[PDB]
């Protein structure tokens, strides 16, 4: 397999974590895409991924798989024992719900805040910025942090009693928030402790 | 199973078509959520779905599954023969990629445009509106139509050889387009051809 990404990107992390977690990290050669130089927004790369984002997976036959969820879906099913994605119908439903919610209410808003209300990748890559929109998404990420705090009050993992794709997404969201210095509120003690523990999980530890 | 939704909603259409496609539509009871009245934004429904959107599926054990993708993922896995969601690892990856991209580049943008650059659900519900952002999202959806047009020139269905959840998402994007009178470009003939077919699928035809 080939992956196109940037090694310290919060979204690329989700896949890198999943790969370690499946013991498949060895299977992959990574190719660098420089986002600061806008390489992802160039015709060559849009040919690989219309959305212009990283990571992207390229199979041995040349099939391209973009989107973290989709790539994780693929690599988790590859070995016949879904570990991150759900075994039963209900596990599949709950993990996908909390994964999507993790994107919606935490990770995406942090990323939109970064690109629109901060300089982001810089005045040369960010052609249109909507400051007020990026701020609305910051506010949404803050509420999202509170939300995951109440979830992780009740449970050790976001989607039940096992580590899943959904935990990987929350981790990446807090990786991104740390990068742009959007502080997890003090009152979210469960989220903060859980995060510091997650940073020591072998799959996450190796990454950082 | 219980579904909380609004019958004519484009996102609720995604689960209704999937339910028909699995022949589970008679196993579900539908509860009306009035979006015009802002019922999805009140604390009563927010306890059900922190994200404040429809549809939400309720199982017999009181489990609530939010998000069209997660709901579909649950019901597709239920009879043990995944039709909409993918059998092989390769099929899950691609279907999930295209399903998500359908959300990103078409469906979600039309919906954001509706809420932000038109009057949407009205002022009692649209308390915050960013017109410039909604307008940019409308252009994003127009580009998305062109993108899915290029795809459908080369494939019978969005995710490849067979009908999937990814087709359902574009259907719903096209339904939303019509609500807001965002015309599909006449030049997008592969997309228009595919949609014409979609309108005569029993599951889709039922819903329309
Ligand atoms: N489940 C969807 C989101 C659903 C959604 O946006 N639904 C609409 C309903 S509809 O417009 O399609 O009928 C909604 O609740 N929107 C109300 C709002 O955004 O205020 C998802 O996959 O994230
Ligand atoms: N898997 C994609 C990743 C999306 C994404 O935004 N990736 C980032 C990479 S990183 O910021 O996390 O390192 C990107 O390419 N952003 C580039 C841009 O928005 O210009 C998804 O889930 O939508």
Residue A66 in contact with residue A56, Cβ under 8 Å?
Answer: yes
With CB atoms and an 8 Å threshold, state whether B93 touches A65: yes
Q: Would strands B2-5 and A56-58 be described as parallel, antiparallel, or unpaired? A: unpaired
Residues ≥6 apart with Cβ < 8 Å to B174? B184, B195, B198
User: b or e along A36-50 (b: 16 or more beta carbons within 10 Å of the residue's beta carbon)?
Assistant: eebbbeeeebeeebb
From which experimental method does this structure derive?
Answer: X-ray
B68: distance to nearest CA of chain A, Å? 9
Tell me how far the alpha carbon of residue B43 lies from the centroid of ligand 1, in angstroms: 17
With CB atoms and an 8 Å threshold, state whether B90 touches A73: no
B80: left (phi over 0), alpha (psi -120 to 50) or beta: left
Residue B163 in contact with residue B22, Cβ under 8 Å?
Answer: no
Backbone angles phi, psi at B50, to 5 degrees: -50, -35
* Beta bridge partners of residue B68, listed in sequence order: none
B166: distance to nearest CA of chain A, Å? 12
Instruction: Give rounded-to-5 percent helix, strand, coil for chain B.
Output: 55, 10, 35
Pocket test for ligand 1, best of B9, B116, B124 (most atoms within 8 A of CB): B9
Closest ligand (CA of A54): 2
d(CA A74, CA A55): 14
> Distance from first CA to last CA of chain A, Å, rounded?
22
Residue B21 in contact with residue B72, Cβ under 8 Å?
Answer: no
Q: Which residue of A has its CA nearest to B151?
A: A50
With CB atoms and an 8 Å threshold, state whether B105 touches A74: no
Tell me how far the alpha carbon of residue A110 lies from the centroid of ligand 1, in angstroms: 21
Domains of chain A plus CATH, in order, are 1-83+202-208 (3.40.30.10), 84-201 (1.20.1050.10)
Residues ≥6 apart with Cβ < 8 Å to A31? A2, A3, A4, A5
Q: Which of A66, A70, A75 is nearest to A20 (CA)?
A: A75
Whether A7 has its CB under 8 Å from any CB of chain B: the answer is no
């Amino acid at each position: 397999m080939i992956i196109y990404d940037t090694p310290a990107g919060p979204y690329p992390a989700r896949v890198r974590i999943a790969l370690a977690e499946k013991n498949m990290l060895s299977s992959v050669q990574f190719v660098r895409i420089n986002l600061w130089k806008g390489e992802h927004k160039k015709p060559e790369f849009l040919a690989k991924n219309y959305s212009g984002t990283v990571p992207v997976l390229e199979l041995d036959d040349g099939t391209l798989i973009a989107e973290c969820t989709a790539i994780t879906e693929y690599i988790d099913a590859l070995d016949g024992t879904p570990t991150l994605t759900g075994k039963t119908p209900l596990e599949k439903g709950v993990i996908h719900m909390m994964n999507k919610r993790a994107e919606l209410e935490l990770l995406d808003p942090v990323s939109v805040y970064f690109h629109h209300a901060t300089p982001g990748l810089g005045p040369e890559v960010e052609l249109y910025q909507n400051k007020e929109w990026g701020l609305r998404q910051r506010d949404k990420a803050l509420h999202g942090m509170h939300y995951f705090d109440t979830v992780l009050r009740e449970r050790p993992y976001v989607a039940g009693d096992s580590f899943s794709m959904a935990d990987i997404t929350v981790i990446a969201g807090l990786i991104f928030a740390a990068i742009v210095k959007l502080q997890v509120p003090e009152e979210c003690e469960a989220l903060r402790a859980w995060y510091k523990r997650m940073q020591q999980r072998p799959s996450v530890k190796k990454l950082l």
